[PDB]
């Protein structure tokens, strides 16, 4: 490979032999795209004029009242599509095109990755089929209607458990046959190399923008940048430019679900064991007998049962620290941001906010500059939040 597939011991390319030329075609394309100024220019242009970048860094005025914490929110909820998904989905479609591909294959749980592939496909003239589990289709039919409205074919997986792990599989099976004409648009900074590396580079503008904006506003770097971790793209998008700034802490928040102790959680990096699945060697949600199981969380967008290799590596060397937040701590932080700053956050990003609130509340005289990554808006979650209250 031209690039290292491993992040320490985490990573790899644990796929069937037949998919290995597809992954090496993809890595060659990417390395080449990276050196090409006009690739970059084309990607920048769509992010500005279509997607809405730079997004804003909002200083929270009211939520930090009576503590010594300054809190800034990186406004990925203001991105076209209403989630950071869009950044990388535009860069992978530009790449499918640069490789002469004409189709896109993708997988989903709660349809946000599906909707973002459908929208980048419709914009760039690629045909797009989305694999989504029948359990997920039944539950996420607003997002299904929306994917279909953008011209994408939605194929209901029924493989046993009919959830995202089954979707990911069937999507890889299809790409085994189609890889000459189709590109697989993988949803997070997980799976086989080069997807961990590709998805990160196509999300790193979140971190590069935060560094430039915080220095403009505050004249110094934050003390911590906080971001939730389903599979890890928004989190690694925020952390990447800060990794060499040893001064800046990087905290990743996994769904603690109903509580770690209950087992009903979605926190494999800190409470699952390493395994080899989804094409990578990484920590995951599994039984004592190596059968993989489902992540649980209040937010359906944090239900990937494993995490990106670069996160598991960053944890090992002690460079980033990973924490969990309960469903209930996330609901309270949802409610708090609504009521005090008039921003309805996504329940996924509420996990990261809830941690920054905890840090604040527990040590109210601690002077600290935090940046939370507000990764999506919560309009989809208002129905969920409405049965809960």
């Amino acid at each position: 490979t031209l690039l290292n597939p491993y992040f320490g011991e985490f990573g790899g390319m644990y796929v069937p032999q037949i998919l290995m030329p597809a992954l090496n075609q993809l890595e060659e394309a990417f390395v080449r795209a990276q050196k090409d100024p006009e690739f970059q220019a084309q990607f920048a242009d769509l992010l500005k004029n279509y997607a809405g970048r730079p997004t804003a860094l909002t200083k929270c005025q009211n939520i930090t009242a009576g503590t010594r914490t300054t809190l800034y929110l990186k406004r990925e909820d203001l991105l076209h599509g209403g989630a950071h998904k869009t950044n990388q989905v535009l860069g992978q479609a530009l790449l499918a095109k640069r490789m002469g591909k004409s189709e896109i294959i993708a997988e989903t749980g709660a349809g946000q990755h599906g909707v973002a592939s459908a929208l980048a496909s419709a914009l760039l003239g690629l045909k797009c089929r989305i694999y989504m589990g029948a359990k997920d289709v039944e539950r996420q039919s607003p997002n299904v209607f929306r994917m279909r409205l953008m011209g994408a074919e939605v194929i209901p997986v029924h493989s046993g458990s009919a959830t995202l792990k089954d979707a990911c599989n069937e999507a890889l099976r299809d790409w085994s046959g189609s890889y000459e004409t189709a590109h697989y648009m993988l949803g997070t900074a997980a799976g086989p190399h080069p997807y961990p590396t590709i998805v990160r580079e196509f999300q790193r503008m979140i971190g590069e923008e935060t560094k430039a904006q915080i220095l403009d506003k505050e004249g110094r770097l934050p003390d911590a940048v906080i971001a939730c971790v389903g599979g890890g793209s928004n989190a690694i998008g925020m952390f990447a430019d800060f990794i060499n700034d040893t001064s800046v802490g990087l905290i990743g928040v996994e769904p603690g679900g109903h509580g770690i102790e209950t087992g009903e959680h979605g926190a494999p990096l800190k409470h699952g064991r390493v395994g080899i699945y989804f094409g990578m060697k990484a920590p995951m949600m599994q039984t004592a007998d190596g059968q993989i199981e489902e992540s649980y969380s209040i937010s359906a967008g944090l239900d990937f049962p494993s995490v990106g290799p670069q996160h598991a590596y960053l944890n090992s060397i002690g460079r980033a620290d990973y924490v969990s937040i309960t469903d209930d701590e996330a609901l309270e932080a949802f409610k708090t941001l609504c009521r005090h700053e008039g921003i309805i956050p996504a329940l996924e990003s509420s996990h990261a906010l809830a941690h920054a609130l905890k840090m604040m509340r527990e040590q109210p005289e601690k002077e600290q500059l935090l940046v939370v990554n507000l990764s999506g808006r919560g309009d989809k979650d208002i129905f969920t939040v409405h049965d809960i209250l």
């Binding site: 790899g12 390319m13 644990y14 796929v15 069937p16 032999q17 037949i18 290995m20 030329p21 493989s159 046993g160 792990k165 089954d166 599989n169 069937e170 890889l172 099976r173 395994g275 080899i276 699945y277 094409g279 599994q286 007998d289 190596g290 059968q291 993989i292």
Partner: protein
């Protein structure tokens, strides 16, 4: 490691190709599966390729997926898998037994420890569906140290470098799945790969004869055996009868 060499020696004297059925272990029940495997051997299977149930198959989809489910429900734990494997070997001392696995189930309790329990129960080879030759060194070295032949898939999209690696690293047999078959088989022979068995879509006696004639040392019939099993799931004695005649047909056709 050995039984394969012995089987290929015996067949080459007989001017005959190997016929290998694939079946998932525990499907549709443990007793049931043990009866199926005995009838397959009885009916003329030359070796056996046994699938263990996993979270889900990738390298194999629809029929196999359905089959794993039936075995999951049947309560086939890894403990039951090796218990079944030990008895199959106790009844049939000579049959080569190969396992089709996924990397997580190998890695779960230690790679080297998976291969030691394999050696203890009398398994001859392991094919780990999702470890490309680029990731195989730990699995290879561990299999070799426990005298388990590491089986590798040689795919349609094979290129020369891949061909040289599959011949340098595999043992037992090569699983054969651009390039004419005739050209793939010649390059494997040149590179001195283990005997190629054709695994793609062998479902008719006609197809086993075609494979042997092409220079493949024999044919693995995947889903077709599973199909008879599904087709007759509540008719068990005639499920077994259909299996027997099918394997006898398949096997007769390899005498070419």
């Amino acid at each position: 490691m050995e039984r394969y060499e012995n089987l290929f020696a015996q067949l080459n004297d007989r001017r005959e190709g190997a016929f290998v059925p694939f079946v998932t272990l525990g499907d549709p029940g443990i007793e049931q599966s043990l009866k199926i495997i005995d009838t397959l051997i009885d009916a003329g299977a030359d070796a056996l390729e046994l699938g263990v149930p996993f979270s889900d198959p990738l390298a194999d989809g629809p029929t196999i997926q359905n089959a794993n489910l039936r075995a999951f429900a049947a309560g086939v734990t890894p403990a039951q898998c090796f218990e079944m494997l030990a008895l199959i070997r106790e009844k049939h001392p000579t049959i080569p037994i190969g396992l089709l696995m996924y990397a997580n189930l190998v890695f779960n309790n230690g790679i080297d420890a998976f291969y030691a329990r394999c050696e203890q129960v009398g398994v001859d080879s392991v094919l780990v569906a999702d470890v490309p030759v680029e990731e195989s060194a730990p699995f290879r070295q561990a299999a070799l140290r426990h005298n388990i032949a590491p089986i590798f898939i040689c795919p349609p999209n094979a290129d020369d470098d891949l061909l040289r690696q599959v011949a340098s690293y595999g043992r037992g047999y090569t699983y054969l799945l651009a390039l004419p078959l005739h050209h793939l088989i010649e390059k494997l022979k040149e590179y001195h790969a283990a005997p190629a068995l054709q695994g793609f879509g062998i479902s008719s006696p006609e197809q086993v004869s075609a494979a042997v004639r092409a220079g493949a040392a024999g044919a693995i019939s995947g889903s077709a055996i599973v199909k008879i099993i599904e087709k007759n799931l509540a008719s068990p004695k005639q499920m077994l009868a259909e299996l027997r005649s099918f394997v006898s047909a398949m096997k007769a056709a390899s005498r070419a």
